[PDB]
Design a protein around this nucleic acid. Structure first.
Ligand code: K
Ligand code: K
Ligand code: K
Ligand code: K
Ligand code: K
Ligand code: K
Ligand code: K
Ligand code: K
Ligand code: K
Ligand code: K
Ligand code: K
Ligand code: K
Ligand code: K
Ligand code: K
Ligand code: K
Ligand code: K
Ligand code: K
Ligand code: K
Ligand code: K
Ligand code: K
Ligand code: MG
Ligand code: MG
Ligand code: MG
Ligand code: MG
Ligand code: MG
Ligand code: MG
Ligand code: MG
Ligand code: MG
Ligand code: MG
Ligand code: MG
Ligand code: MG
Ligand code: MG
Ligand code: MG
Ligand code: MG
Ligand code: MG
Ligand code: MG
Ligand code: MG
Ligand code: MG
Ligand code: MG
Ligand code: MG
Ligand code: MG
Ligand code: MG
Ligand code: MG
Ligand code: MG
Ligand code: MG
Ligand code: MG
Ligand code: MG
Ligand code: MG
Ligand code: MG
Ligand code: MG
Ligand code: MG
Ligand code: MG
Ligand code: MG
Ligand code: MG
Ligand code: MG
Ligand code: MG
Ligand code: MG
Ligand code: MG
Ligand code: MG
Ligand code: MG
Lengths: 147, 51, 127, 101, 41, 142, 132, 186, 52
RNA sequence: ACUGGCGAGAGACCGAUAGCGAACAAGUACCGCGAGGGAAAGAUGAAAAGGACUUUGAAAAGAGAGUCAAAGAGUGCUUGAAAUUGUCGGGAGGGAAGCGGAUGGGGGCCGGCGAUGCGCCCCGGUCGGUGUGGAACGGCGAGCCGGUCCGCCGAUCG
RNA sequence: CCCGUCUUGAAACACGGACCAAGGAGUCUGACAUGUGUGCGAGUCAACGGGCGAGUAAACCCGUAAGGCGUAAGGAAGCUG
RNA sequence: GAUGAGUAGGAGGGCGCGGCGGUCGCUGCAAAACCUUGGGCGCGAGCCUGGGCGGAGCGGCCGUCGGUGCAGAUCUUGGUG
RNA sequence: AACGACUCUCGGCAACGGAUAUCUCGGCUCUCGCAUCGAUGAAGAACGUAGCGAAAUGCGAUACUUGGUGUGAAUUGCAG
């Protein structure tokens, strides 16, 4: 929006806000990331530690699908069950719902948070952390593995 | 705006209500205002405030 | 109509603020411009130089925008717009817009007489 | 010579406002049309309109002739607003008149 | 429940309940912002 | 309006077809409102004819020095053609003055507009007399 | 509003097509209304002006004048009418050009083609306007 | 001359009004301008000031955090100058009276199902003109991405400030200056 | 270069202005493809328009 | 896919120092041995009705006259700014002038530049007046509380 | 004391400026960032495309295991979370 | 109630130019532009108006947009001392 | 130290110049449709060609056009 640009407020002020002494020259410090080690050294070290150098192993032709592993925490597991199925869970304590996280696009079950009180759940997943399994078991549930 | 009877009767289905959602705008609900009653005079001159 | 204003109008300055050196150069118009030059003696407010406008010259808020006749001007373009001043005839006077035809000025002038609304330029283009 | 910063076709002409905001704007406009004070404030002449919102029988949808369409507007009191539009027909001031406007 | 009268034309239920959309908030700021941006399209 | 008047004022106070502004938005700015139900033609929430359910209209009626006194009906805010309760008055000023005081202040319709309504009636009545006969005094003394 | 994709609403294109139109096209553009008597007779509203037609001027300073066409000056978008003249500074007489849309045809120069044209113009009106 | 700073005038800036053009918010400001002036209530003064604040100064409050702070205070009315969001991590929602500028669709449904009530600030004025028996709450102001980048620069000692990097991985600011094996660790 | 900002990596050092692809024909492309489908449907009638 | 060719539609684009170099006999006139370089230049009037004739002059042309709504539109002619120039009128000037502030002299300009009403009396004229009838409505919420208009009595003032 | 300008310092024997008209310079775009306005909110986004539609370059509708960003981090990695 | 300097620089509130979406108007009983020893308003950018010329268009207000404001650049083109 | 000349200055008129305003058969940009040069001699170049023409436009010794078809009374600056 041109009418809000501050250059308009500076019309008639000679230097357009860039000063009489310093002026606005083309590239008085080099272009782009020039001088990262010489005259912009302080800037890089102060704000971008680790910028220069090499670390770790290369991986030629690394495909990300091999590493696909979405995770879901314990505290979020109950939210996957439909509301109508939640009522059934509290209506019969003999059985427990079977939550197959893979059907909801999750592979591994992590163990952040707690489960609903007095509600056993059977969790079906590809992978699971030890804390997640412990919390499921101590709540009266069980873990089933799939692929 | 001049509404035909058929068009006027479709407004609830198209835009839904504050309680149930629209039938043609999947998962849409009418927005709520930050002020339920915009009549300041009633609020300011109410017995509760004036007491 | 009797003007409602009663406080006298005090003009802090009646001369205009002329742009510096507009006398010297034809291309430099008289409309005010703040001199931005580093050495500008006008900007630096040396005595015996052109004066610059500042807020201290502001007129009294009670008498601001009041014409010498004691009313404030409102520009009218037809008879309907003139009726807006019926309840403010002691405060606002009407001025017919410069581009209104002489035929429509007669209607406005006649209507203003009925409403006791002052017209600043009622004699315009009637000869 | 060459103008400063010549205009380019790949200027960002269009805008994509979120759909939910566009629906919010439409709902507000629909609600505003049922308030006679707002309708009058926008310049519409609805002094002879029987009621707002103005809902008419579905038989109006069967009208085929423009002469019958105008008679329908007269019956419901909407003709004065339509007459205002015709009487306001005028040539656009400025350069727009030679730009097919 | 509020209802709206249905005007009848010459040569032709007479009320309809007021739809909820007619009670929606009036937000001139939102309308102006949306109107200006979409009119560029 | 069908919605609260305070809400309407928030919407129409910035821009409406009846808003007349001149001399920009600086100190020289002058603002008037020209809706028929605004006694003083002032752009304010008090006198606004758009943002108040209860409004007073006083203007010449047809011919024969008749003055129209119309008030907006509280239960007809959604019926523009029947919103006004018109009362054409063609009697002496004193009789008309009592009628305005009765329909504005006595019934607690808009007591805050009693002074404006009487002045509006006084201005309208005087202009009708001048129209019939013509200007005879300049009203410049005092 | 127009809906034909082959038709332009551009002012520039309309004016160019009018002022560069060939002579055959200018003939149709230079049409005049028939008189109320001829309209009721042939059931035709407009006709291209011809050299030997008789017309009456209904607009301009020569309003009311009647005479016979003597020249259809298509290049100048005007027609010349017998006795509709003015005097130059030297006293010579020159015909005054009049746009054919500002005259009314009182008598038609009928011929084999003109009569056939009248039938086609009336045939459409007698069906598309009345029978519909 | 007078030996003062800036002619004795204040150089501080605070919001004296909302920056928004929302007509409903301005009506609420008018309502609470009157309440603060004519009552002298500290609750009303605080409410008025918070209505002026920007979006980031009115952070949302999760329903789960609302429940924890409302435990043992059923009689009191919860007041939030901001938005109340739903939290899937909370299972049991007790009945509670909550006043907020805005409720998310899921948060409103859960509160209403549990027998609670969702109030606006105009309804609060009718029930608590002086803020009597209210629980005034604020959402977490500094829990957002921008704040993680604030403070001492990432490269100075004893800094945990998050740097600005276009991606995350071994090749993005993990080298010299980030470990002893490459010059130094910082 | 100044202040705390992400390191810029704009790939605008070639003659990129000669290789800009605009999309002003996007509505036209939708129209043309719809016409092609409509024309194809009549050609293969009564065979299903969904194809094989 | 498509800044070429041919045809077509459109525009929050430019409006004759702009927009293509080119709105026009423009890739033209012109320049360069050559490869190449490359302009300026749109608008009388609705209609030529484009100024007969008289008189002066070698002629250009002037004076008068004529056409036109208009030559204060007269063939580079719509409108016709500034720099700059002539003339008439006012004024000033002992090696600059201009400029800020303050008055004065001389000009020019301004009747919303400055009013003539108001109150109380009677003479006349004119125009309307408590209580009951109708007409179309309203405020407050079934019921109370009202005004406007028309008519009829009384009242006899305004 | 002549303006504009660089300058510790300009009436300067520092430079530009004979005069007038018109033209004449922080823009567009990609990335990112803080701030603010608006919508929704553990979600959000109609973006390629499709269905259509002011007989229509707009508007309206469509995300079914789509995708982006967010919802979990640490490690060079194997991995753990 | 106190208080008033400001280069480089920052910000706010305003003035002016040309479009677009709206709205309110003006004009052959004379629009725009231009001229004026007419008058007035605003601290100011500017605005309003008388008279003249001109002979067909133009303006106010809300929103929104931009090839949007010149005394200078040995600035460009044209004109003139 | 008048008058007048000269210089400067203000106003009226007259010049000089072509700004401004209003225009526009042009330009620019976007979108769409179509696929058609040449040894059967192309693009380009040259010369010629009309009752009165130099250019532009057209044409080729059948030379601002022949023929067919459509349209249905002009062309036009003058002459015939
Ligand atoms: K700066
Ligand atoms: K493309
Ligand atoms: K050129
Ligand atoms: K002229
Ligand atoms: K310098
Ligand atoms: K130097
Ligand atoms: K110098
Ligand atoms: K930054
Ligand atoms: K997603
Ligand atoms: K989809
Ligand atoms: K490691
Ligand atoms: K307008
Ligand atoms: K003037
Ligand atoms: K604008
Ligand atoms: K002189
Ligand atoms: K002179
Ligand atoms: K021009
Ligand atoms: K050949
Ligand atoms: K030739
Ligand atoms: K032929
Ligand atoms: Mg500065
Ligand atoms: Mg500089
Ligand atoms: Mg620097
Ligand atoms: Mg740079
Ligand atoms: Mg002044
Ligand atoms: Mg200095
Ligand atoms: Mg004038
Ligand atoms: Mg203009
Ligand atoms: Mg002091
Ligand atoms: Mg200071
Ligand atoms: Mg090493
Ligand atoms: Mg260290
Ligand atoms: Mg390059
Ligand atoms: Mg092509
Ligand atoms: Mg050019
Ligand atoms: Mg121009
Ligand atoms: Mg003309
Ligand atoms: Mg001229
Ligand atoms: Mg001059
Ligand atoms: Mg030095
Ligand atoms: Mg200097
Ligand atoms: Mg020296
Ligand atoms: Mg130098
Ligand atoms: Mg020099
Ligand atoms: Mg300029
Ligand atoms: Mg943000
Ligand atoms: Mg996915
Ligand atoms: Mg490990
Ligand atoms: Mg200061
Ligand atoms: Mg303008
Ligand atoms: Mg002068
Ligand atoms: Mg203006
Ligand atoms: Mg432009
Ligand atoms: Mg520019
Ligand atoms: Mg200049
Ligand atoms: Mg400068
Ligand atoms: Mg120069
Ligand atoms: Mg030069
Ligand atoms: Mg010379
Ligand atoms: Mg030819």
């Amino acid at each position: 929006t041109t009418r809000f640009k501050k250059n308009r407020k500076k019309r008639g002020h000679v230097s357009a806000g860039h000063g009489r002494i310093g002026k606005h020259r083309k590239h008085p410090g080099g272009r782009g990331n020039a001088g990262g080690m010489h005259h912009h050294r302080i800037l890089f070290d102060k704000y971008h530690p680790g910028y220069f150098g090499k670390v770790g192993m290369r991986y030629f032709h690394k495909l990300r699908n091999k590493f696909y592993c979405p995770t879901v925490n314990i505290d979020t597991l109950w939210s996957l069950v439909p509301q109508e199925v939640k009522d059934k869970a509290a209506a019969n304590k003999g059985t427990a719902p079977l939550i197959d996280v893979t059907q909801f696009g999750y592979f591994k079950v992590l163990g952040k948070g707690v489960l609903p009180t007095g509600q056993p759940v059977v969790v079906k997943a590809k992978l699971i952390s030890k804390n997640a399994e412990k919390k499921i078991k101590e709540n009266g549930g069980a873990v089933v593995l799939t692929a | 705006i001049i509404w035909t009877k058929c068009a006027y009767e479709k407004l609830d289905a198209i835009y839904g209500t504050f309680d149930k959602p629209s039938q043609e705008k999947k998962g849409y609900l009418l927005p709520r205002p930050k002020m339920v009653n915009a009549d300041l005079a009633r609020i300011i001159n109410s017995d509760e405030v004036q007491s | 109509a009797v003007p409602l204003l009663n406080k006298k109008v005090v003009k802090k300055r009646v001369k205009r603020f002329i742009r510096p050196q507009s006398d010297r150069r034809i291309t430099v118009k008289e409309s005010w411009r703040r001199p931005k030059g580093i050495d500008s003696r006008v900007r630096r407010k040396f005595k015996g130089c052109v004066l610059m406008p500042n807020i201290g010259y502001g007129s009294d808020k009670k008498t601001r925008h009041y014409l010498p006749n004691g009313f404030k001007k409102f520009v009218v373009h037809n008879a309907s717009e003139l009726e807006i001043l019926m309840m403010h005839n002691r405060t606002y006077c009407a001025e017919i817009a410069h581009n209104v035809s002489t035929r429509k000025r007669k209607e406005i002038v006649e209507r203003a007489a009925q409403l006791d609304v002052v017209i600043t330029n009622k004699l315009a283009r009637l000869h | 010579g060459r103008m400063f910063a010549p205009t380019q076709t790949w200027r960002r002409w269009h805008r994509k406002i979120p759909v939910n905001q566009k629906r919010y704007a439409v709902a507000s406009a629909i609600a505003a049309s049922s308030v006679p004070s707002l309708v009058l404030a926008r310049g519409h002449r609805i002094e002879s309109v029987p009621e707002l919102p103005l809902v008419v029988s579905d038989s109006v949808e069967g009208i085929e002739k423009t002469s019958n369409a105008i008679k329908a507007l007269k019956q419901i009191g909407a003709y004065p607003d339509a007459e205002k539009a015709k009487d306001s027909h005028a040539i656009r001031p400025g350069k727009g008149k030679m730009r097919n406007r | 429940i509020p209802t709206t009268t249905v005007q009848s034309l010459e040569n032709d239920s007479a009320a309809v309940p007021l739809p909820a959309v007619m009670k929606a908030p009036i937000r001139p700021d939102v309308v102006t912002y949306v109107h200006s941006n979409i009119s560029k399209n | 309006t069908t919605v609260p008047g305070q809400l309407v004022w928030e919407i129409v106070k910035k821009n409406n077809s009846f808003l007349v502004k001149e001399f920009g938005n600086g100190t020289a700015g002058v603002v008037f409102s020209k809706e028929p139900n605004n006694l003083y033609n002032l752009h304010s929430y008090k006198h606004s004819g758009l943002a108040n359910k209860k409004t007073v209209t006083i203007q010449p009626d047809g011919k024969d020095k008749s003055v129209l006194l119309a008030t907006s009906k509280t239960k007809k805010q959604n019926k523009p053609s029947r919103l006004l309760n018109k009362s054409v008055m063609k009697k002496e000023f004193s009789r008309m003055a009592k009628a305005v005081t009765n329909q504005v202040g006595d019934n607690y319709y808009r007591p805050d507009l009693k002074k404006a309504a009487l002045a509006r009636l006084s201005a309208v009545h005087r202009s009708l007399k001048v129209t019939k006969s013509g200007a005879k005094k300049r009203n410049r003394q005092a | 509003m127009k809906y034909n994709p082959r038709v332009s609403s551009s002012r520039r294109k309309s004016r160019k097509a009018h002022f560069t139109a060939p002579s055959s096209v200018r003939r149709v553009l230079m049409s005049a209304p028939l008189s109320s008597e001829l309209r009721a007779k042939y059931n035709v509203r407009s006709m291209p002006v011809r050299k030997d037609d008789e017309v009456q001027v209904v607009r301009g300073t020569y309003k009311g004048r009647e005479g016979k066409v003597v020249q259809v000056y298509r290049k100048k978008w005007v027609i010349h009418i017998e006795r509709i003249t003015r005097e130059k500074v030297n006293g010579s007489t020159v015909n005054v050009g009049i746009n054919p849309s500002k005259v009314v045809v009182s008598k038609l120069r009928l011929d084999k083609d003109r009569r056939s044209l009248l039938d086609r113009k009336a045939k459409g009106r007698a069906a598309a306007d009345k029978d519909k | 001359g007078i030996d003062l700073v800036a002619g004795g005038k204040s150089k501080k800036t605070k919001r004296t009004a909302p920056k928004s053009d929302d007509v409903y918010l301005k009506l609420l400001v008018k309502l609470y301008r009157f309440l603060a002036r004519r009552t002298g209530s500290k609750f009303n003064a605080v409410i008025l000031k918070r209505l002026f604040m920007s979006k980031i100064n009115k952070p949302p409050l999760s329903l789960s955090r609302l429940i924890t702070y409302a435990t043992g205070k059923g009689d009191n009315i919860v007041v939030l100058v901001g938005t109340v969001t739903d939290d899937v991590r909370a299972y049991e929602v007790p009945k509670i009276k909550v006043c907020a500028l805005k409720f998310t669709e899921t948060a409103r449904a859960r509160i209403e199902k549990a027998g609670g009530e969702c109030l606006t600030f105009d309804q609060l004025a009718l029930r608590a003109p002086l803020g009597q028996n209210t629980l005034l709450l604020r959402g977490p102001k500094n829990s957002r991405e921008a704040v993680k980048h604030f403070g001492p620069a990432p490269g100075v000692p004893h800094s945990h400030t998050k740097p600005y990097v276009r991606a995350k991985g071994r090749k993005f600011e993990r080298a010299r200056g980030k470990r002893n094996s490459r010059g130094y660790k910082a | 270069m100044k202040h705390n900002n992400v390191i810029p990596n704009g790939h605008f050092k070639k003659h990129w202005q000669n290789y800009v692809r605009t999309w002003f024909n996007q509505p036209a492309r939708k129209t043309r493809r719809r016409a092609a489908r409509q024309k194809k449907a009549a050609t293969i009638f009564p065979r299903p328009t969904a194809g094989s």
